[PDB]
Design a protein around this ligand. Structure first.
Ligand SMILES: C[C@H](CCC(=O)NCCC[N+](C)(C)C[C@H](O)CS(=O)(=O)O)[C@H]1CC[C@H]2[C@@H]3[C@H](O)C[C@@H]4C[C@H](O)CC[C@]4(C)[C@H]3C[C@H](O)[C@]12C
Ligand SMILES: C[C@H](CCC(=O)NCCC[N+](C)(C)C[C@H](O)CS(=O)(=O)O)[C@H]1CC[C@H]2[C@@H]3[C@H](O)C[C@@H]4C[C@H](O)CC[C@]4(C)[C@H]3C[C@H](O)[C@]12C
Ligand SMILES: C[C@H](CCC(=O)NCCC[N+](C)(C)C[C@H](O)CS(=O)(=O)O)[C@H]1CC[C@H]2[C@@H]3[C@H](O)C[C@@H]4C[C@H](O)CC[C@]4(C)[C@H]3C[C@H](O)[C@]12C
Ligand SMILES: [Mg+2]
Ligand SMILES: [Zn+2]
Lengths: 72, 51, 1341, 443
């Protein structure tokens, strides 16, 4: 087959695996947590209602995301 | 480097060889002259061979 | 408001935007760069003056022997361009320099000079640039592709991930100069910070700080912020800076005023910091444990003893707080460390610092640069100062300083040359801050780190290397320097620099053959960026990083034109409006934006200056005054793109085309194609061979005219005037009265270039298009080149396609071309092959070029003349002779019975061996032109004398036609003398022109004027006597051939290849194809009206490869031919000018907003008939690329004709005569003709020549040798049980040099046996193993 | 290797899958030695030199001599990357005008050769074991089963599948509706004469031969409620198969299991002859379908605008909740890409549901909906070329292009190829596209 057909298959592979990773991240299933998995603060309503079942307050989330921004 | 990957010795053709048409002609003519000397006598064929 | 030339056929132009930046002269890169290179440039900047001011003046070993620079010159060539393609010289230009050898007196530093011998010395021949940026090095037109390499400056790289297996990324920072020692910073996974000078050993990175006069106090106050603790009468108070506490553990009660605003254990969220800010806490009383891990900056010692309490950068434990308590300190300095943001790095690296202070650090640097050298005070000082602080031994170029100040967020873009304390410390701060979270890393591909060279700067560097290798010799010959006996040319050698510069221009990974097989190919080859070459990264070292596209390509390098396959992305093709900047980085236009207006001032942006702005998007409808139509518009700010408010944009794209190249901006309806497909489309449009009658893009993209004109092929008018005499060779423009210089007006003349070879073996023709007695405006085309037509780039031909399967003849991508396309000879492409027949000089004697040949009667010698060269015109075919050539071959060495045979018939065995230049087996042509070069040691034969006489007649004719014009200009100036002061009007046209010199005139300044102009006349006379003398002498001389050759005879066959199953073809959108059965006319489909659809492509290729652009192009084409046939009916049924005007006007307005309204009420009645006759084949249509014609416009433009709006007609099969169910699509698609011709590719070899080291097949002629029966094929045959075929595949057919001849004897004698033997390759292997001391033998049993 | 050649290839469906074309000139230059021998044997030229001059003049009798020595003399066609052991196969030659080594269409999938200019190299077997191996080890009709699995590698590829799929389908009210026929034969006499359209449900009397009688074939006739397409095709099926092999709508998977059943039940000879016959009749009825593609075929859902409106509304809501400090930047990024992927799937499913069932037509009564005859749809459904994803890109929105690193960019292409693309969307597409080429060209 042609040389662009194979490149289309690889692009499908690449974007599909990326998107399905990032959908695997977001939870969308409730496990009501009511305060952090680290700090203990109450998780406000709006945050727990957007992302159901989210273990961490906002600050703890930003902080872990920033320690992980340097990739561990 | 202009090709798959060559060295200039890989292109220097040959000139000692004989074109295999020549080999076939020489053999075919050996056979034909053999027959033509079959068309002579002992004195005839032997003298023309040895000549 | 059009010209009289532009009205030949006025391309219907969709495209809604107004163009505000007309297309730049597409070859700006090559021309402007080589212009900066070669010119006396009264300033030290770039050019040759740069190299000469760099390497000169040469001072000897202080001995008052100096050789300095004055100025240089570029003598005009000896052979001009076309002469230099005929003969084979390098179109050079001899150089000259005014070197000035000065010698000072001994007993004199600068005492009185004793000699200044000033003499001009030759060196090298820099090959000048043609008008088209294409040098001529050895007869062939070569082009030097611009390079793209890392700009000297600073770079902050990651090398993320894989190392150390923890995932933790490192953040290294390199300071690359133009010339000098590097400097690198890097983190270890243990997170201490290390340095390294040029790629040598690591070091505790604080050592270089200390080496720069830094002790620990000021280090810690540079790389850290302070937090003071206070002991105010009870237990360890602390300063409270409020924002110090975001994202941190609260290991204590944060009370204030005896009130609790934050409590222990928790985390200090933004709520807490907000409330502390509102509640005004400044000095919190925390326990000792929290100081227990802090770090102390300043030094502390017992003030009563002077004994060292705590060194700088030690961790305060409770005991040390106590110890300094009793010393009387209430201030305490502590580093504001933190795991998130203000991380401990320099402190812990001081932990790693083995050394203690400055001198030790300099010692360690001296011991890391070079081992074994014992350290020393002054040795250390010298070495460290001479790494980064020596104007002589280290210099960032000014480009270096500019990047180094723009990558630090500095102020001045230009400045010093060497580093400093502040440059190093800013590098380190930027590095630590990269690792702290704020800031990010510059990936490699970012065009802020790819400075673009070109011909100019690369040739300048090669001349630089030449100058250094010659100044070695200059200083050496000055070693022995006699003061006044060696003039300033025996110190130098000319051939060195010529060797270097020729090696560059003729042997480079850049200086490569022009892809001159289609005007788009040249002008997409000279616009080219390459990342390979000497000084760039090649494939192996790097690497996947640079293949990628990066969002700083938007208008600086084409994303949808790059050579697919082995090296993608390393051959980025430069954008349409891109340019090289002052420093070098690619830059592009942008329209400036005021408060809320879109100004029309275009303003250039490089790569590093863009992200700090916020650029709009060209696809933004703006409201007739320069205000946007909304308050929020799509933009792109820093890589990302998004909606912005109206009062925030700063820059709008110049035009919707600027994201692309001249390659992919010619694909109409590019906007609907998967980017891979536009890639393959442009990369198959660069290869279309110029057909016989190059027609036009029936559906174009606006840029096609600019590509045809700006490339060199079209014959563009230099000055507007009337046309006096057209002809198949020359065009004679009579310049007007206003475009005409004051003295010696004359008339412009263009000698076109008739049939002639290009590098790819095609026909670079030029045909006039402006007929006799016809105006032409300045800047207009006179003569179309190959594949241009009316000055509109026409690569292939338009023709009728119908998408439908049609019996598997178009199975995968195959194509089914009705014979109405090949009868017309419309893809019939002309290929002009060159065959040479040299005549060499062997030890036995000189080869003959006689017509007397053995073993060939008059039969093959009917086409030969009296001298062995063929006539100009004989239609040679496969296997005939073009040049009869015989080599003396002594020692016939008769054999057995062959000798008997010669006795039988007495036929004298000849002493001569036939070796005549016979046509390659297969071509079939017309010998259009025979040239005979001769070593000037041989008596030129009879035919070469015919050729000399003929060329000399031609040159005499030409130079005499030139003299006529010149003397007419001088007679004009004479009249301009008489016209003022006593002209006698009609007493000057009657008498002969030659007797105007003796015209009466009073002896004023005007009589002396007549005398002076007579002097000019006689000067012209003698000038052209001697110039025709020089022309006759260039022709008459011998040539200067290669060593040992008598005479070469070139013979230019001119084949005409038609079309035949195998010839690749392709649209523009990337639908390849291999025309597969050249069907009759009857068989083809035919719409209800009768016309058979010429091509028949395949429907299964539009959905699977999402290039729906070809269906939209087919529909726009069908509508176009609808308009065409309507005009054809209105013209054949001949109506009038009136109906034609109303109808063409209906076609040119057509609905939606456009920028093309023409108003034919200004076309005279007789121009509209010419306009119709140029439209009667079909109304062209423009469609700017990302701004094309949306579907509904096409549907209405169909309804203006009479086609069905669906686009799909109902077709009747041609064989059975019964309607195809489900109507097909038919239309006029423009199809190229790629030159992967079949008869170039076909090949077959039964018994050819053979190699010399291993008796394998090797042929040459078209690799006249077997296909490589490689290894994977051997795996294949072993997979089957077949082993006999393998054994003969590499014992009988290939190597065993008795096996093959016995196989041939058997084949002729009808006995398909084989007698293998053993391969000669393995026998070579036995010998090569055995030459080594390895006794390999074969047991025999 | 002496005795070889190579050239650009082409299609030529008029062949049987055990024989390839071979140009006259390439034939005469491969088989020079055998030709010389044949000439001096038949006495048409005295000695080998004269035979050389004769074939170098291309006289009249050399062509007849070559047509004799090319009668049963198999050659070996090969391609450049010979991945697996089918990269080399024998064929008998068929002498051709021109310069293209014409290749049988079913053989492509084995060679993995498309006809867009990929060159094939012909070797010629010399010895007599070599010819016997080309005939009984490497002939094309003795490699139908891939060595990597017993299933056939003679699966019809693209035009033939569209041919069969358009031949054996059914609309609801065409000509000759519900009439009765007495065999496949008068179904053919119907269709080729213009009384009943190619696919219109009919009753026929087919006669399927089951063979439970061990190697014996028990006849059995019936009245299948089938179409005119199916009964016209059933003539090409051999005796062995049962009639339910074709009574369905013949995609590509089903058509390959047709051949697989025929091979398992009857063997190799009838399955070769049946591969040839399916290919021929598929090509003919596809060329008769007129199945063209066109720009009116790609029916955007009118509901796409609402889906994208709501998608951008939810993204703006996440935006507001990001400025309010209620979700970190990572979580807003993932919420955005989530709601866009949801919108992508919704638009895809809505377009496919407007594209497949769109044919609502009327049988002798009110109306009915049925699987569409939409050219782009059949080319995506039967299995000729493409599938739901590529159609999704021509009608629905086109996904989210993802830059090469992996971090899929969050500015989704809200447009598609039928509509245009503005410059941002295209310049984003370039990232993923050039990445795709740069990998499958290093591959
Ligand atoms: C690109 C490739 C086609 C090329 C041949 C196709 C065929 C199988 C596909 C994966 C699997 O289905 C498993 C998994 C399913 C999840 O639901 C979503 C993602 C996963 C990882 C898919 C990624 C990708 O789409 C794959 C590799
Ligand atoms: C086509 C090939 C380059 C492909 C890129 C060029 C590069 C150098 C050429 C050879 C040399 O000239 C040496 C020699 C001269 C004899 O006189 C004729 C034979 C030889 C072997 C030549 C054949 C061929 O032409 C060569 C291989
Ligand atoms: C005297 C006149 C001065 C300009 C007025 C000279 C300068 C060059 C002369 C023409 C050129 O030779 C080209 C051409 C050659 C044909 O064969 C004969 C006609 C042409 C038109 C010549 C006529 C005339 O003689 C010209 C214009
Ligand atoms: Mg291919
Ligand atoms: Zn928390």
């Amino acid at each position: 087959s042609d040389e662009a057909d194979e490149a289309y298959s690889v692009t499908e592979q690449l974007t599909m695996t990326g998107i399905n990773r990032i959908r695997q991240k977001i939870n969308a299933h409730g496990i009501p947590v009511y305060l952090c998995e680290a700090c203990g603060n109450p998780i406000p309503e709006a945050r727990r209602k957007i992302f159901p079942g989210v273990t961490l307050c906002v600050e703890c989330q930003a902080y872990q995301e920033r320690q992980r921004k340097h990739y561990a | 480097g202009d090709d798959e990957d060559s060295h200039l010795g890989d292109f220097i053709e040959d000139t000692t060889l004989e074109l295999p048409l020549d080999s076939a002609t020489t053999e075919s003519l050996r056979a034909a002259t053999h027959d033509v000397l079959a068309g002579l006598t002992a004195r005839e064929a032997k003298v023309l061979r040895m000549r | 408001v059009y010209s009289y030339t532009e009205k030949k056929r006025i391309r219907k132009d969709f495209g809604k935007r107004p163009q505000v930046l007309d297309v730049p002269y597409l070859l700006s890169i090559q021309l402007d760069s080589f212009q900066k290179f070669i010119e006396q440039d009264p300033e030290g900047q770039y050019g040759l003056e740069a190299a000469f001011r760099s390497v000169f003046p040469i001072q000897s070993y202080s001995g008052n022997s100096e050789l300095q620079y004055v100025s240089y010159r570029l003598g005009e060539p000896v052979f001009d361009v076309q002469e230099c393609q005929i003969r084979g010289v390098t179109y050079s230009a001899p150089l000259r320099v005014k070197l000035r050898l000065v010698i000072y007196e001994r007993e004199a530093p600068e005492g009185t000079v004793k000699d200044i011998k000033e003499q001009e010395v030759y060196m090298g021949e820099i090959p000048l640039m043609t008008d088209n940026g294409t040098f001529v090095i050895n007869g062939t037109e070569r082009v030097i592709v611009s390079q793209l390499h890392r700009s000297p400056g600073v770079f902050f790289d990651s090398d993320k991930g894989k190392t150390h297996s923890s995932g933790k990324v490192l953040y290294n920072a390199r300071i690359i100069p133009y010339r000098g020692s590097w400097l690198d910073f890097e983190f270890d996974p243990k997170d201490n910070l290390f340095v390294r000078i040029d790629r040598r050993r690591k070091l505790p990175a604080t050592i270089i700080l200390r080496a720069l006069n830094y002790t620990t106090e000021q280090i810690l106050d540079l790389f850290f912020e302070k937090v003071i603790f206070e002991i105010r009468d009870n237990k360890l108070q602390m300063e409270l800076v409020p924002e110090r506490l975001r994202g941190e553990t609260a290991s204590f009660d944060i009370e204030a005023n005896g009130k609790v605003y934050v409590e222990k254990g928790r985390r200090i969220t933004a709520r807490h910091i907000r409330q502390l800010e509102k509640d005004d806490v400044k000095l919190i009383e925390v326990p000792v444990e929290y100081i227990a891990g802090k770090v102390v900056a300043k030094d502390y010692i017992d003030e009563s003893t002077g004994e060292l309490i705590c060194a700088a950068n030690m961790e305060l434990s409770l005991d040390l707080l106590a110890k300094l308590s009793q010393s009387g300190h209430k201030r305490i300095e502590t580093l504001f460390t933190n795991d998130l943001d203000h991380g401990p790095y320099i402190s812990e690296t001081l932990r790693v610092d083995p050394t203690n202070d400055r001198l030790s650090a300099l010692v360690e640097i001296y011991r890391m640069m070079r081992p074994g050298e014992p350290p020393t005070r002054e040795a250390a000082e010298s070495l460290f100062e001479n790494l980064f602080f020596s104007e002589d031994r280290y210099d960032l170029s000014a480009v270096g300083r500019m990047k180094f100040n723009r990558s630090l967020l500095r102020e001045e873009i230009e400045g010093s040359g060497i580093l400093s304390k502040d440059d190093i410390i800013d590098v380190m701060k930027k590095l630590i801050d990269i690792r702290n979270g704020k800031g990010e890393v510059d990936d490699i591909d970012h065009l802020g780190n790819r400075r673009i060279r070109s011909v100019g700067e690369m040739a300048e560097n090669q001349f630089r290397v030449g100058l250094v290798r010659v100044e070695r010799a200059v200083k050496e010959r000055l070693s022995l320097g006699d003061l006044d006996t060696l003039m300033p040319q025996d110190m130098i050698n000319a051939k060195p620099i010529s060797a270097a510069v020729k090696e560059f221009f003729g042997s480079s990974q850049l200086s490569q053959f022009m892809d001159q097989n289609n005007p788009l190919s040249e002008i997409t080859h000279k616009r080219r960026i390459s990342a390979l070459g000497p000084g760039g990264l090649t494939r192996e070292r790097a690497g996947f990083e640079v293949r990628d596209v990066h969002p700083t390509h938007y208008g600086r390098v084409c994303p949808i034109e790059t050579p697919e396959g082995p090296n993608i992305g390393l051959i980025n093709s430069l954008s349409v409006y891109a340019q090289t900047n002052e420093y070098g980085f690619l830059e592009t236009p942008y329209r400036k934006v005021t408060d809320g207006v879109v100004t029309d001032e275009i303003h250039y942006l490089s790569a590093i200056e863009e992200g700090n702005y916020v650029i709009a998007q060209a696809n933004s409808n703006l409201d007739e005054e320069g205000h946007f139509v909304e308050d929020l518009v799509t933009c792109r700010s820093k890589g990302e793109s998004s909606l912005f408010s109206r009062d925030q944009v700063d820059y709008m794209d110049v035009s919707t085309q600027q994201v692309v190249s001249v390659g992919a901006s010619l694909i109409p309806f590019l906007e609907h194609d998967d980017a891979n497909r536009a890639l393959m489309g442009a990369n198959m449009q660069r290869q279309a061979v110029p057909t016989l009658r190059a027609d036009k893009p029936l559906v174009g993209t606006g840029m096609e005219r600019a590509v045809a004109v700006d490339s060199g092929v079209t014959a563009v008018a230099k000055r507007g005037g009337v046309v006096q005499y057209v002809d198949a060779s020359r065009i004679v423009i009579k310049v007007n009265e206003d475009e005409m210089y004051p003295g010696e007006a004359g008339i412009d003349i263009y000698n076109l270039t008739k049939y002639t070879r290009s590098n790819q073996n095609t026909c670079i023709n030029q045909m006039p298009c402006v007929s006799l007695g016809e105006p032409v405006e300045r800047g207009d085309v006179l003569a179309d080149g190959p594949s241009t037509d009316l000055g509109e780039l026409a690569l292939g031909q338009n023709m009728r396609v119908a998408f439908m399967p049609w019996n598997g003849y178009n199975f995968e991508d195959s194509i089914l071309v009705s014979e109405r396309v090949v009868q017309e000879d419309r893809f019939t492409t002309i290929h002009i092959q060159e065959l040479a027949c040299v005549s060499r000089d062997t030890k036995l004697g000189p080869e003959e070029i006689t017509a007397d040949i053995p073993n060939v009667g008059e039969a093959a010698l009917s086409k030969l003349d009296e001298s062995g060269i063929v006539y100009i015109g004989a239609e040679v075919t496969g296997g005939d002779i073009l040049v009869g050539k015989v080599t003396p071959k002594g020692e016939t060495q008769l054999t057995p019975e062959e000798k008997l045979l010669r006795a039988i018939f007495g036929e004298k065995a000849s002493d001569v061996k036939d070796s005549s230049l016979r046509v390659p087996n297969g071509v079939s042509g017309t010998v259009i032109d025979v040239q005979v070069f001769t070593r000037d040691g041989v008596e030129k034969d009879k035919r070469a004398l015919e050729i000399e006489e003929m060329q000399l007649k031609q040159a005499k004719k030409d130079l005499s036609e030139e003299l006529q014009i010149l003397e007419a200009g001088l007679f004009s100036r004479i009249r301009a003398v008489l016209v003022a002061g006593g002209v006698e009007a009609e007493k000057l046209d009657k008498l002969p022109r030659d007797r105007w010199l003796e015209l009466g005139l009073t002896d004023e300044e005007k009589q002396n004027q007549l005398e002076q102009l007579a002097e000019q006349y006689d000067e012209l006379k003698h000038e052209f006597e001697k110039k025709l003398e020089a022309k006759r002498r260039k022709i008459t001389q011998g040539d200067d051939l290669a060593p040992g050759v008598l005479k070469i005879v070139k013979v230019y066959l001119a084949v005409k290849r038609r079309i035949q199953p195998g010839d690749k073809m392709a649209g523009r959108h990337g639908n390849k194809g291999v025309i597969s059965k050249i069907n009759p006319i009857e068989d083809m489909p035919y719409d209800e009206n009768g016309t058979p659809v010429d091509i028949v492509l395949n429907p299964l290729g539009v959905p699977s490869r999402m290039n729906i652009g070809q269906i939209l192009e087919t529909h726009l084409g069908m509508a176009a031919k609808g308009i065409g046939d309507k005009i054809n009916a209105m013209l054949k049924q001949q109506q009038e000018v009136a109906k034609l005007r109303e109808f063409i006007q209906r076609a040119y307005d057509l609905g939606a907003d456009v920028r093309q309204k023409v108003d034919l009420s200004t076309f005279s009645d007789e121009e509209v008939m010419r306009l119709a006759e140029n439209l009667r084949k079909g109304m062209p249509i423009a469609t700017p690329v990302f701004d094309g014609a949306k579907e509904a416009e096409i549907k209405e433009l169909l309804k203006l004709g009479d086609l069905p709006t669906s686009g799909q007609i109902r077709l009747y099969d041609g064989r059975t005569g019964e309607q195809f169910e489900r109507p097909v699509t038919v239309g006029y698609m423009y199809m190229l003709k790629l030159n992967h011709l079949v008869d170039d590719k076909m090949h077959a070899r039964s018994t050819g020549s053979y190699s010399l080291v291993t008796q394998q097949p090797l042929g040459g002629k078209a690799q006249f040798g077997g296909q490589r029966f490689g290894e994977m094929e051997v795996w294949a045959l072993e997979a089957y049980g077949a082993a006999y075929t393998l054994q003969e595949m590499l014992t009988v057919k290939s190597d065993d040099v008795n096996g093959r001849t016995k196989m041939y004897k058997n084949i002729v004698d009808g006995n398909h046996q084989m007698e293998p033997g053993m391969p000669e390759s393995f026998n070579v292997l036995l010998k090569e193993i055995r030459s080594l001391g390895i006794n390999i033998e074969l047991e025999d049993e | 290797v002496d005795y070889s050649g190579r050239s650009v290839i082409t299609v030529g469906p008029y062949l049987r899958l055990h024989q390839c074309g071979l140009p006259k000139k390439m034939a005469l230059e491969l088989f020079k030695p055998f030709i010389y021998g044949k000439l001096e044997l038949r006495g048409l030229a005295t000695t080998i030199k004269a035979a050389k001059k004769m074939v170098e003049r291309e006289e009249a009798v050399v062509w007849d001599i070559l047509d004799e020595v090319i009668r049963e003399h198999p050659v070996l066609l090969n391609r450049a990357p010979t991945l697996h052991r089918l990269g080399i196969q024998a064929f008998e030659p068929v002498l051709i005008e021109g310069k293209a080594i014409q290749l049988h269409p079913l053989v492509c999938a084995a060679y993995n050769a498309d006809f867009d200019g990929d060159q094939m190299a012909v070797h010629v077997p010399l010895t007599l074991e070599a010819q016997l191996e080309a005939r009984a080890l490497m002939m094309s009709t003795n490699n139908i089963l891939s060595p990597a699995n017993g299933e056939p590698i003679i699966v019809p590829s693209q035009d033939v599948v569209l041919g069969l799929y358009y031949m054996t389908r059914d609309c609801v009210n065409a000509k000759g509706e519900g009439m009765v026929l007495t065999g496949p034969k008068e179904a053919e006499r119907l269709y080729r004469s213009g009384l009943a359209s190619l696919h219109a449900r009919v009753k026929v009397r087919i006669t399927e031969y089951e063979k439970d009688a061990n190697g014996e074939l028990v006849a059995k006739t019936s009245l299948k409620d089938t179409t005119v397409g199916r009964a016209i095709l059933w003539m090409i099926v051999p005796k062995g198969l049962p009639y339910s092999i074709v009574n369905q709508a013949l995609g590509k998977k089903a058509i390959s299991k047709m051949l697989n059943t025929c091979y398992r039940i009857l063997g190799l000879k009838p399955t070769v002859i049946f591969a040839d016959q399916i290919m021929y009749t598929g090509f003919a009825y596809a060329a008769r379908s007129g199945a063209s593609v066109g720009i009116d075929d790609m029916v955007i859902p009118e509901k796409k605008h609402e889906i994208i409106s709501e998608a951008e509304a939810e993204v703006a809501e996440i935006q507001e909740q990001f400025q309010s400090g209620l979700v970190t930047a990572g979580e807003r990024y993932n919420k955005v890409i989530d709601i866009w992927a949801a919108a992508n799937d919704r638009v895809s499913k809505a377009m496919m549901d407007n594209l497949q069932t769109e044919t609502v037509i009327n049988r002798d009564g009110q109306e009915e909906k049925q699987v569409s005859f939409n050219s782009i749809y059949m080319m995506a459904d039967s299995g000729a070329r493409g599938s739901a994803a590529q159609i999704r890109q021509l009608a629905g929105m086109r996904g989210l292009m993802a830059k090469p690193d992996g971090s899929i960019i969050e500015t989704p292409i809200t447009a598609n190829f039928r509509e245009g693309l503005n410059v941002l969307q295209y310049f984003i597409s370039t990232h993923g596209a050039r990445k795709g080429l740069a990998d499958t060209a290093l591959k």
